[PDB]
Design a protein around this ligand. Structure first.
Ligand SMILES: O=c1cc(-c2ccc(O)c(O)c2)oc2cc(O)cc(O)c12
Ligand SMILES: O=c1cc(-c2ccc(O)c(O)c2)oc2cc(O)cc(O)c12
Ligand code: NA
Ligand code: NA
Lengths: 115, 116, 116, 115
């Protein structure tokens, strides 16, 4: 798998567990088509979203359902979700990790792309 | 103005100048309708997007065109754009500052919300 | 003033008010000498720490007392304090804004440096 | 080992490799005493700094030598180093990960503390 998502909680200092994550691929008509999805594990990670065969060059969106995460912890959040939009490029490293660090009124996201 | 956007460049330690910003509002049919747009000034700030009257309750998306910014400083960056999606004014009018801190493979965004 | 500190609270989406800040400057003997201190206002900003005359070249440390801040909002936080260490004015006078964004187990800091 | 350090590079979208990291423990006289050190690996991680026996409650400082990292990449940085200061507390989770995300004029740090 060439795509992994990792989510951390800056309030609790913990992995963000059981966060829903939806991946979309941009279609020729510019709409976002569902591509893969899952929930983060006890380590805050979501593995196995896709395969090398399927993750072709294109524009992808990773939506992390942060609002539901915070609400389940009883904490009032700002954002509806965190969205990460990027082009997959075959000239670069093979493995993409999309990481996000969550707070109620702020988030950070980073891409770690490696060979 | 009840909505301001501020953008900083974490490589240079400077305001991010001339960053295009597009704001959308979710319509009754669930589509993202264009709401306002502009670009950051020499201070990295974008003022005057909207008015108290116009910025009603709704779900808003602030799209910050980071790729176009970094396609100009010689950095092929990772992201297409930073998208900030939030419900606004659902407990009455508030003032929102949407801040973003940009690097070529990473960004942070925070909201500062105040009650006038 | 050539040195300003701004602090935001990522839990509340607000300025971080009444945050104590201590600035030190490395002395010739390598010790950290007290240089200036203050606390953030209702805007989350701390102005007036120093002057152009006083803020000479050197290595400075800005200590932001985050634990004491969060020991007041009911959050036992992780860090003791955020420390920001940098060489200043070594190419002539500059204006420095040291910004920090606080969560109980994490913080970000960025510098915005401008030439007057 | 109860203490791990992980460092990422936000400019290159990569682990931050070969970054020097120094850990200190606060002594009774308030000085910082060297405790452990190393360099990050090809994964941006530094493992094996200490042991459960040695990492007793106390105040620790992790200094990450960011200036030298950026200079080796030919990039002009702001900070001398990034400093992370915290109390180790035996009531909490056993394992501490100190993570840092580096840019030339900015850094983020997070603690992930787990059982
Ligand atoms: O979004 C961020 C916004 C700001 C910020 C900094 C100065 C301001 O006058 C302001 O209105 C916002 O500072 C940051 C500082 C950080 O270290 C990380 C961040 O994400 C931000
Ligand atoms: O996105 C972030 C991701 C990570 C991160 C932390 C541990 C990992 O094993 C990893 O693969 C990524 O650490 C951060 C640490 C930060 O201080 C700020 C961030 O945005 C991140
Ligand atoms: Na309402
Ligand atoms: Na000089």
């Amino acid at each position: 798998c060439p795509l992994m998502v990792k989510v951390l909680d800056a309030v609790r200092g913990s992995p963000a567990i059981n966060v829903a994550v939806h991946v979309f691929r941009k279609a020729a008509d510019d709409t976002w088509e569902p591509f893969a999805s899952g929930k983060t594990s006890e380590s805050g990670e979501l593995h196995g979203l896709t395969t090398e065969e399927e993750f072709v060059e294109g524009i992808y969106k990773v939506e992390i359902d942060t609002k539901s995460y915070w609400k389940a912890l009883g904490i009032s959040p700002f954002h509806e979700h965190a969205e990460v939009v990027f082009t997959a490029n075959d000239s670069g490293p093979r493995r993409y990790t999309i990481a996000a660090l969550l707070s109620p009124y702020s988030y950070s996201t980073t891409a770690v792309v490696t060979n």
